[PDB]
Amino acid sequence: TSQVRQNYDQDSEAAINRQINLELYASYVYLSMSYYFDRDDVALKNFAKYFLHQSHEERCHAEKLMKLQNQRGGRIFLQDIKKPDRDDWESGLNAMEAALQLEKNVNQSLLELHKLATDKNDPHLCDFIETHYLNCQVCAIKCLGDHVTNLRKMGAPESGLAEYLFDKHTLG
Amino acid sequence: TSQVRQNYDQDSEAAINRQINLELYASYVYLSMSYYFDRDDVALKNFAKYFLHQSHEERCHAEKLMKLQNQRGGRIFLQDIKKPDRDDWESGLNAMEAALQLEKNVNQSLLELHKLATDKNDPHLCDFIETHYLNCQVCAIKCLGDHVTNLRKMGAPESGLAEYLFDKHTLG
Amino acid sequence: TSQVRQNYDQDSEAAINRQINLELYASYVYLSMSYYFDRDDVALKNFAKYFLHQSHEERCHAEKLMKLQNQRGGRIFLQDIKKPDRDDWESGLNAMEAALQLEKNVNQSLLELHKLATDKNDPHLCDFIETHYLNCQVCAIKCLGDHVTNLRKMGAPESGLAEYLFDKHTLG
Amino acid sequence: TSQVRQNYDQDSEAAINRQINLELYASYVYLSMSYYFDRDDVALKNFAKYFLHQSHEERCHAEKLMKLQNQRGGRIFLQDIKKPDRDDWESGLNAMEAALQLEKNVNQSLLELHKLATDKNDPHLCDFIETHYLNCQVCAIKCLGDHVTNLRKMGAPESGLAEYLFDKHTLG
Amino acid sequence: TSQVRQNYDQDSEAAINRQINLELYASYVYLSMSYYFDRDDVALKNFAKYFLHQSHEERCHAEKLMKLQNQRGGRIFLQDIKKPDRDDWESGLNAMEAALQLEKNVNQSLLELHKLATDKNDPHLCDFIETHYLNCQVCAIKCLGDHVTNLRKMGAPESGLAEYLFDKHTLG
Amino acid sequence: TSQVRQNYDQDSEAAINRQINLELYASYVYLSMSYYFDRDDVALKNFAKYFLHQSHEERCHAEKLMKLQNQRGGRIFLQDIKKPDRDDWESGLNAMEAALQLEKNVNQSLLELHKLATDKNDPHLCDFIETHYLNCQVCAIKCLGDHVTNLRKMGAPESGLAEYLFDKHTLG
């Protein structure tokens, strides 16, 4: 029993660890996407920068989660960070849609965590998720949807010119 | 179905569209009050300025609700903006009292909305309402309450001097 | 009867209240268009930004009209603000063509209002309309005409790439 | 009843009045600790400084609570501020453990207050607690837990050298 | 016995502790007074602002007093801070009068304390009272007395306008 | 076959992927150590900062490796990032020694990679490792050895004061 623990359910704790790993996984996915667009045969520096930044963001969420854990007296338990589903992300459009899912998936997990926080009557954990994740996710998912829409309407992925311009005008 | 929609109930979506219209309405009411005090037979520039500002506020609130709708993949449907209940707001004290009532109504509407978001377990929608409207409405109610009270004690509406000085000292 | 009223015919008064409402209406159509381009499935930020500005400009025109009413002793009477024709504006080209028409209509109304002022021999009303409205109308129409022409030549609406580039190069 | 009152339960109101007194009590407890370390036979200026600041923090919370009460239409009702249960706090480590308990009790109390807020469907009062008190208490309990862990691991309270160096290196 | 203690009579010590509780009490009276004018049905921010300041002042005095105690070798013993008389101060003029009284009582107590220090031939405790409390009280009294005069003369509390203007012109 | 590939052996390529994962693993270890010292029962902010920074460094090496891979035409293949051996790092000293090994181990891998680069006569890959890793490793291993030595000589881990001071004077 931690001296600072208070109103922090066991389910909550395990769930945060569950969440820390998921965030790290998302991060790992993005890192993968990033360096795919860095390949001499894909060559889209901005898509590359975009994802690398997205990757670093997920790592911050992960670290803020670990912070939260220690903050409420819970104990951190890391677990293997599973590698990404793919190695080759096909195209800019395909990668964007993959991210759209990744985010919607992490959002699903966040909402479930919030539901558990509510059921366990842990307002502090609820506010933490409300203020630091929920709203960011909606923004991110919205951002991705938009990029996907633009890429689709520009003629991607068949059109290489489309992905090129998008790289320059939206991600640049 | 929107590619970014997730955990967004149709009722909530319809409720947001309702709120949007209510905000546009409130904004119309304040616009009306504003120019009332701009009449050559009322001539209270600061009351006029105060309400014009309030008007622009409610319109900013409307646009933020519309932004919300899109962010969560809902679809906006505008409806007529009914006209204010009057064209003559009588006195400054009277318009202040009406605003107090208009705000408490709008707030009432937001409490409905927030309660709905809860029943439909939509934490994002609840935090949006919390962190953006519920807190601002309370401050607003309190402000109007204060103005209403000051106007009454100074002698309004009976005393024309009262409203003149409140115009200069509180609204100027 | 206002103490400042002088040579302000009643038909003029009513014509102006009607214009105030027409202006507010235009502001509404524009607000509607702005947030259409904000939809995750349209996603043209500069179009959204562009029309949101025109909405603010039209609203600002309404208010000057309201200021004018009070300047010459007239009395303001507001009416409901009818909802825009559509909820979906299709494409950039379509919204542009729609906006061009809207503009020509308001102008159409201003011109009649000026023909009335001329008939009622009210030089002040004529000058207020010439200086503050007719010029901006000619300008806005030419601006909108040009936009429409560009979009057509680029291949819009069929060319999604056309609307993306226009969004970035002309509206950005 | 207040003209601004809206969705503010009687029980909630009384709960605040209660919390207001609790915060003042905390403030008093810290003020006592503060000057205990200011005694020539204790002599730890930074521990003193630390608690004197915590003391002012707690009073500020009380004052913000009183603001809330009038902000929603409630009515402040002050009660005697009961003196702390101790006059001599033995040591820096002992005092820290005391503060830790005092904070977990204030937090325990805010959580009950937040519960009540939810049982009464009062979302405003809910965000007010989450945003201005819930995270603050968590961060504070963590800080105190840390301080207690360091002091113990340093040799306190047996070692006078230990509390001295903590006074200089952690609180200075 | 304290190693720093010198020429500090046990009665002086007990009187200093009594004074500490008294300054803290006064402090609590002003705090109560302050938020009374923050009420939506009183609404006089500068009165509220004014008394809040006087409140923080009283606490600074209480704190300096506690510092004196330790400086001389005495030992602090806190007592309950008894709640103020009223919960409703009726009017600014009334609150101002109550304050004038509070100050004259605190003063009476200080003068007593000074004579005690004199009979106990403790010049240090005499000069401390002279320099840091006595002239401050005289000023406070004269200030409060002046405020009462203006409020009575402007026509308080019958005239709401009287207190409103005093709020703006003297306390603003 | 990549268009930019040239003098880049298959063994080399696979070895770099091998290395990328190792770097990411090291990074993961450090992240773990970092947040262990953030626990309310360990409480050494600087050891915490130290490792978190060390962690971010290993992630840069990882990313620079992925960069290298694409640079020479090789293809990146990520793999699960195995979790750290431990969850509880016992103490500051124990963590330092663990890092000393982690670094010596990563150094062993780097030297082997360099040997392979030499055998495959790939000077570019040799210089890359010589300039970007070999020298840094020697510095890091030296740094860790020193910290270990200091902690040992100060009385760590039995002495909690030792770890405390070290945290403040060397890591701060």
Ligand SMILES: [Ca+2]
């Ligand atoms: Ca002209």
Ligand SMILES: [Ca+2]
């Ligand atoms: Ca919240």
